[model samples]
Target: EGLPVLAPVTKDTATSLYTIPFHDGASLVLDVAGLLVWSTCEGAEIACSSPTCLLANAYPAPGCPAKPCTAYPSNPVTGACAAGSLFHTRFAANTTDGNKPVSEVNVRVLAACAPSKLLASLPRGSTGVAGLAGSGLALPSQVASAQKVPNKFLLCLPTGGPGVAIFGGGPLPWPQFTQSMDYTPLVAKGGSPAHYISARSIKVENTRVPISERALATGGVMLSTRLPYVLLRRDVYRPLVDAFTKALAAQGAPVARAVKPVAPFELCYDTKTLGNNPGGYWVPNVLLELDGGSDWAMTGKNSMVDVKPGTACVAFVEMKGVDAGDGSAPAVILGGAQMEDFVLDFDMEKKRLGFLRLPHFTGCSSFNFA
Candidate 1:
């Protein structure tokens, strides 16, 4: 009877159960856009009639029986969705002071037991995705709902050491970094769970790309854990590229020596042309003037990626050349690579995203696990 069962979440919108299986935190991918928390071990299923079923926003699965709610969970990398059952489970972790582990904390999570193939494209040893979307069923809300912690989570993505993600309760990283965080109003696209922000302008060094207010207002800039580089829609991509090329040339990297375009990357330069530093290849910065009066600045570490021997490329990619998704796509997608060593705070209750780029002296992996 002591065997752990995946528990079903309560439908009482107000009553949330932080219930189910304890899986390794490292095995789950962190998805800011994903809606459900799913893994192989699985959990208690939601009845078709349960309000929890409706809250799942899952489409009806044809040929699949009706009673157990069949939710479609997505593979964040491939953008593939598979049919699965909704269930609530337990997420056990220890409370930390930004360094060593302390006391244990078990937060209930809601997810679907997605098919086995969904984990194929993920990193080796990855079993499921930890969805931290802006939904009631997502991890953040579920943890805060029952535990009464703030409806916020902090993410320090892994550069090397197994990064860190803290939900609600203490211990936050450093007070100095937290106090200095810049905030931007976190926007929602018609209630969509993806994270969005209003970015007024983008600049390469001192040159501001002449992007229209409407373009920024329409889709805005979104944050993605799925992409490793920044992606821009056509209208925004052209101006920024031209501006970057001209600005970079002034830094001694000429446009003529630029190599061939890669699949996802458009501009690449001879690696020897640019000096290397721990921060990244020496390149003009890409800065975004956000709605909250704070500028998100991308330096070499966040802007350039080495694709080949003696070759370094601007990490920004074009959305047009790629599968620019449906109407839901953002004008610009700031990806994971751009956020290295940066601590991001996604606060649902505050409706704001707070960010602070750690100095070169430390990294996300600096947290003490030993």
Candidate 2:
């Protein structure tokens, strides 16, 4: 009863997922599959003990908790009850333009009972992990439909500045004419309900490596915001690493073998030594070739992360055998880090994904949703 029930969404429908402001300043997309009951920080026991109790006046009560409350039916198997209401959670941040005031927005969602074991911690803050994908409420694009917003949303992740997320069907909040957007169809595979895409091939500069037909047939790629780094199968990753090594060597910047290998990272470099020249450094360009021949490029900065001062490592990991069962799992995962400097538009209504490169993103502080 705790497991997530697969919800197949149609192109004509739209669902709203809350955009949680992460403690690290990044945004987490909280997509709901089913609703769970949530109670105030102080009402946890009362809410859990009273199955028929409602949240009234922000407290758990049969009549009126201190706060507003909504009630729903209990799950027969798990004996969980929920509120059939959505709430708006808010946060604050400074944007590229300037500091914006905290605003409230309503998101339709189901409220359910909290799990038995709840952990307490310093109030630094966070969002639900990918665990929500399994048991939490899955929201359809209905919010978009109800608000007359488009069944579409855009995420622009910047490397060193504020990023932007826009939802709704009207014209993009940003300047549409300033950038060119390319699109590819989103491939929905059986068993998996997440956002999967067809990653036909990968290119190291101009050298293209074709993905296996079997893998393509089994969901070739995934666009996951939860994953921070790109993951590639050994067969694909080995060759790409080789090509990148060759290109770096050609540029007189070879891998710094003197540095000890980092766990989970096969390739690393002593940037201190590689960038000995105060004047310059070298990095390679990587591209993911999608279904429609459109290429998503990764500059050196996006492909490498600075693990420590003077040490920068490639931001890709080899997929373990368990991760790629019989080589049928997705061949590649386009993680959030690689998505920087571009506007990623998920047009659910059209079942398409759009990409727009932002050459001037470094200078902007906040997203100007036009």
Candidate 3:
């Protein structure tokens, strides 16, 4: 029985599977965050107890046996275990041009048939499908190889809404008059299939915070669309928090004293007092200084998120209990929230990541393929 399914390459793109019985029909939408070759759906018997399958009424392919499948966590600092089974499946998506359908692409999916809290936390669509896209076993990579475009993709995370995720294609057409795009070499890790960037240090308001080399060597910095906020190691986070506190106090921004703590976020501020300044509030910028002179600067608006009508909180959390092999598990996760309003170019062929900041969402319309 062969059926075509809709697949997405990014978190913003919606993918789904539908079934038809002429009169009686139904469909399932996958709550996917990004394009990854593997998927943990319901009913394949990995190791969990209550697995939520993305495909409605999806059963394992009749002849295929359950095989071990593992994936990197959205937080690269934390590792993942083999908790699912692999099977062959067919799916499709609208080509980049968004006109014709690209169908009949065979791929592997991880069935998280067992009960799992981790699987439950993944973003779910209205139909209850959870998925992610990443460097390892990615749909974009497979599509690029199959379509003969080599390995290349472009990600434009706009401030307005879900941005574009283009698979393959030549160089992106970026305006030369804008802030010049900067490049950084991707740091490859042995045994780890996820993308790793060699981030050298953390700077809070231009003040450099010391980052451990061991952490850098152990896949410290990872760029992910699934995670909404930036993550830092406990060590790095301490200094960062201290620096942020000092900066906020310096600006005379009133701190929320009696407010309940937000899980993962220890610092909170009164947005009411901070006031909605068109030029951004008093929050200081956070920078991830990369191996080269390239610095990924997080604006004050990006660094602080409005949790409530009157409350705003820092968007960084500390990583703990993650094993980095040296008893030190500090990691830096550059999540999607901080990536807004920017065009990220991933050149797998060149092993470089290009960053171009867009002052406004309209800048996306200017995209051109080089």
Candidate 4:
């Protein structure tokens, strides 16, 4: 069987009587509001159930029914048939016998009444900001799916912890170390990874010992690093939010029938009871780190991770210590504040651009030497 042509509904789907509240005390009167009635005939023979057999689809057919149908009364006196009572008809299936299509039918007017609110309106640009004097709420803008920008990173603060890390495979900071690289290059004599001391210190807890000493003694200390790239600064956060809101507004206004709020407003920070001064190096409230595989520097046939020229490198803050547990400190031990686990990539275009910074979280390491 040939496929059917499903024509779209060209007219607005609003009917005057579709929304009237049926009040018991209200008067009942009929009003024909210039609504156009259209239909086609399925001349006898063949299955009337076919899509084309419906008067709505059978229009303008070859040798089709000559005249269209109407519903107004033809005679006011004797109850003669209306001018076009049988013009439009609903369908009944295979039951209509042999080869001939089913007989033509009339368009059904069901019933209609005066449209209560003649002029209905929506909000300005349908953004829920309605026109001056409309009783109902304004409609919201309808956004398009294509205009949506996906969120790239998920931010979270760990419970009962100092700060959180956004863990993903990205790049690390400069002066990184490799397996063969020695901690000596990064620190001073006796100031190895196993025995390195700090210069300045902050108490992680209320203990008097320096933070570096405490970190070494405690095995591991979680530190919140400074944001490396100024480009990713918090200064740009709100503007990005506003841009997204406007984008959604523009996309949703055209097709939505009703106004609705488009959302995704996210702003939260921990502000409850806590111990400690709740001060000290206040985290910028924004964690900025390179993601994994991010290239910080790329030079001729060489690449580096976590080291960028313009960006500040991650360093230990507020700490001082002896190079050895031995009491004497080295004139200059490899900077204990040095970050690790970074992979650098060098490009041929820029010769020795120093260390580049990758946005993704990779790793930290010891300094490398020839």
The TM-scores of all predictions, comma-separated, are 0.85, 0.66, 0.67, 0.13
TM-score for candidate 1, please give it: 0.85
lDDT of 4 by residue, 108-183 (tens): 1211111222122211111011010000100000000111211111111111111111111112213233222211
Ranking by lDDT: 1, 3, 2, 4
Ranking by TM-score: 1, 3, 2, 4
Top model number, TM-score: 1
Q: What does candidate 3 score on TM?
A: 0.67
Task: State the displacement of the C-alpha of residue 50, model 3, in Å, after optimal TM-score superposition.
Answer: 30
Q: Which regions of candidate 3 fall more than 4 Å away from where they truly are?
A: 1-91, 96-119, 126-136, 173-179, 210-219, 252-258, 277-280, 322-330, 360-370
lDDT of each: 0.69, 0.48, 0.50, 0.19
Clashes found in each candidate (C-alpha, N, C closer than 3 A): 9, 34, 13, 79
- Overlapping backbone residue pairs in candidate 3 total 13
Model 2 deviation from the true structure expressed as Cα RMSD, one decimal place: 10.9
**Per-residue alpha-carbon lDDT of candidate 3 for residues 279-302, written as tens digits (9 for 90 to 100):** 256677777777668788787656
Which number leads on lDDT? Answer: 1
